[PDB]
Every structure is written in structure tokens, then in C-alpha cells.
């Protein structure tokens, strides 16, 4: 029984244009075991309507999941992805960098 930390990628479906509707995504991959808690944050507080794919795994048996939501980006509105897994001591927060 091994333990692998999830790789966390935060990205928008379309390029960030302030005021226009878009989709925010958080893709968690490469983890083992499956048991995981993921949240999408808006300035530090969790978003309510967030859909997620059913559990899946890649060839090497590591698990992957996609968490998304239809958002509207503005100037100072900071977004992030909070992740809780057995490998993490405290929840890991990875910010959304528009230019990345």
C-alpha cells in the first residue's frame, strides 16, 4: 500500500478577459489512494456549485479527477484550488496564475 501526492494544475478553459464568462479548472492527478477532498476557492472561501468527474485512473494505476465551475474573472478576484489528501499534513492551496 503506497502513497503518492496529487499533482495539481489550475487553468481556465478560455483566456482571461475581465468581465467575460469562462470555466475554471483544477485537475488533480498522480495520487494513491483515491480518498480525496478538493475545493475551488474564491478569495479564500469555497465555491458552492462545483461539478466533478467520476473517479478515474491512468495506466500506471494512479488516480485523476477534474473539478470545474462556470466563473466570471475580474481584476483583483483571486482564485485557487484547495486539496486534502493522506500525504498532505495541511491542505495544499495552489493559486490560479492567469499568465501561467
Amino acid at each position: 500500500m503506497i502513497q503518492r501526492t496529487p499533482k495539481i494544475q489550475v487553468y481556465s478553459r478560455h483566456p482571461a478577459e475581465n468581465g467575460k464568462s469562462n470555466f475554471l479548472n483544477c485537475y488533480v492527478s498522480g495520487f494513491h489512494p483515491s480518498d480525496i477532498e478538493v475545493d475551488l476557492l474564491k478569495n479564500g472561501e469555497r465555491i458552492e456549485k462545483v461539478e466533478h468527474s467520476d473517479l478515474s485512473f491512468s495506466k500506471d494505476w494512479s488516480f485523476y479527477l477534474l473539478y470545474y465551475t462556470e466563473f466570471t474573472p475580474t481584476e483583483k478576484d483571486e482564485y485557487a484550488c484547495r486539496v486534502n489528501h493522506v500525504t498532505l499534513s495541511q491542505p495544499k492551496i495552489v493559486k490560479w496564475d492567469r499568465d501561467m
Binding site: H14, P15, H32, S34, D35, S53, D54, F57, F63, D99
Partner: protein, 276 residues
């Protein structure tokens, strides 16, 4: 023909204690999900209007029943023979099974199993092949599993007769969505600066279908070797996302362009230049 050429069902069985076991399943066509599984009701959730393929509502209910009794019986016997196999709680078993079409007409079927994220068993032409990663446990399992003819026969029917009969049904029924060609959209940005006098050149590609795509950083007609390609990340609208980066010096950034080749573009490639 383009798009997905394979069908597979997956299984993730989390065993917490001697009498607590949850199972999660789903049907896929490559990386695209077409089936979901409602564990409580023991029925399939059909994510697309063509998810049934060419199968009848009787043929699909027969299959729902097979998986339902399997999910129960699998969990039941693993909880029964856990101490016999020296298993330490908590543990997770994983399993992928299905078939695929090759160019020429041939359909190869597969079934792979796992324990603790490591290979346990495999199925190469009607027989259990224990993986060395499973050790003595895997051998002890394959040697036991062959004695139950009733379950070995129903795996053989499913894998070598029902699976290909299914694959063609869905590949055909879903021709409209599966062999669709959605055009990519591209944009540039300057990522986090690696060196104090350097610059991270980022090329973004998104909104495309099918999966095969070519993206490189160019200098006219000469491609850069230091072009680090990102992972092919998904979007829930059955489209993809790809990043292509280049670590470069300040003055060298000018003259550089990103090139995107995709099957929906039809020769008309997307070339985007860096503006000084």
C-alpha cells in the same frame, strides 16, 4: 477513422475494514466517459444518448445484473479470504477491462488487475497471468480462480464475444460526437521568470477535439529542441488543453513563434508570433 478506438470499464474497490467496502465503476471510450455507475441502485448511468450502442434494453439489463452480482460477490469473497491472503486494512483493488479496434479489423481484448497501486493480475487469451509485482499472492489467486469454471466462462464471453459486439455499436452510434473535429484556439503569455535575465515563453492551446495535436516553439522554419510540452489536460465539454513552454533569454524572445498543427485545421496551421 479518427477518435477513440477502445472501450473499457474500470473498477475501484476501497476496503476499509472487514465489513466495509465501497466500489466505484464507469465505462470509457479512451479518456472520454460514456457510462457512470450508481453503486446503491446497482444500475448504469448513461452519459450520452448513444451510450447503449446497438444493444437492446434487455441486453443492457442482463449486463447490469452481471456487474451487480459481481460487485457484491467480489467484495464478499475478498472480505472472506483477507486473512488467508495476509491482507492489511485499509487497501484498494483496481481493475480495467475491455477491448480495442486495430487497423485491419482485429480486436484485442484485455483485463488487468491491481492491489496497492501495483499490478496484480492480467488476462492473456482466456487465462490468468499473475504479475511478479503481486508476488506469491497473485500466484495463489490465479491458481484458485481457475477452479471456478462458472465465473471463468462468463469472463470469456464478456471479453471475447460481448466486448467487440459492443465496441462497434458505440463507435458507430456515436460517430457524430466521436469523429467530430473542433478547432483549437491559441494565446500567448509570459510565465514566471526562471532566470533574473531570462523569460518563460508560454504557448496555450485549448478547445480542441480529437486528442492528437502537434505544438512547438519555432524560429521561422527551425524548431526549438528545448520546448517543454505540458500534459494534455481535459475540459468537461470533451475538449482538451495543452501548454508548450520555452525558457529563453530576453533578447532572443523576438523572432520566436508558436506553431499548432491539428486535424481540424486542414493544413492551415496556427502560427502566433511574439511581439517586441
Amino acid at each position: 477513422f479518427q477518435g477513440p478506438t477502445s472501450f473499457h470499464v474500470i473498477q475501484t474497490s476501497s476496503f476499509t475494514n472487514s465489513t466495509w467496502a465501497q466500489t466505484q465503476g464507469s465505462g470509457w471510450l479512451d479518456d472520454l466517459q460514456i457510462h457512470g455507475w450508481d453503486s446503491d441502485s446497482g444500475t448504469a448511468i448513461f452519459l450520452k444518448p448513444w451510450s447503449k450502442g446497438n444493444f437492446s434494453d434487455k441486453e443492457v439489463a442482463e449486463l447490469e445484473e452481471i456487474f451487480r452480482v459481481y460487485i457484491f460477490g467480489f467484495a464478499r469473497e475478498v472480505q472472506d479470504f483477507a486473512g488467508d491472503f495476509q491482507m492489511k486494512y485499509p487497501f484498494e483493488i483496481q481493475g480495467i477491462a475491455g477491448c480495442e479496434l486495430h487497423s485491419g479489423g482485429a480486436i484485442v481484448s484485455f483485463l488487468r488487475g491491481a492491489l496497492g497501486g501495483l499490478d496484480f493480475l492480467s488476462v492473456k487469451n482466456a487465462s490468468c497471468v499473475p504479475s511478479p509485482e503481486g508476488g506469491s499472492r497473485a500466484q495463489k489467486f490465479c491458481a484458485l480462480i481457475i477452479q471456478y469454471q462458472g465465473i471463468m466462462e462468463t469472463v470469456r464471453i464478456l471479453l471475447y464475444e460481448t466486448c467487440p459486439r459492443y465496441l462497434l455499436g458505440v463507435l458507430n452510434a456515436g460517430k457524430a460526437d466521436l469523429q467530430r473535429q473542433v478547432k483549437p484556439e491559441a494565446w500567448l503569455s509570459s510565465g514566471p521568470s526562471p532566470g533574473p535575465g531570462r523569460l518563460q515563453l508560454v504557448c496555450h492551446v485549448s478547445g480542441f477535439y480529437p486528442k492528437p495535436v502537434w505544438v512547438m516553439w519555432m524560429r521561422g522554419e527551425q524548431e526549438q529542441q528545448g520546448t517543454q510540452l505540458g500534459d494534455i489536460l481535459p475540459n468537461a465539454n470533451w475538449t482538451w488543453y495543452l501548454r508548450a513552454t520555452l525558457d529563453v533569454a530576453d533578447g532572443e524572445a523576438a523572432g520566436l513563434s508558436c506553431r499548432v498543427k491539428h486535424s481540424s485545421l486542414e493544413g492551415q496551421d496556427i502560427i502566433l508570433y511574439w511581439g517586441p
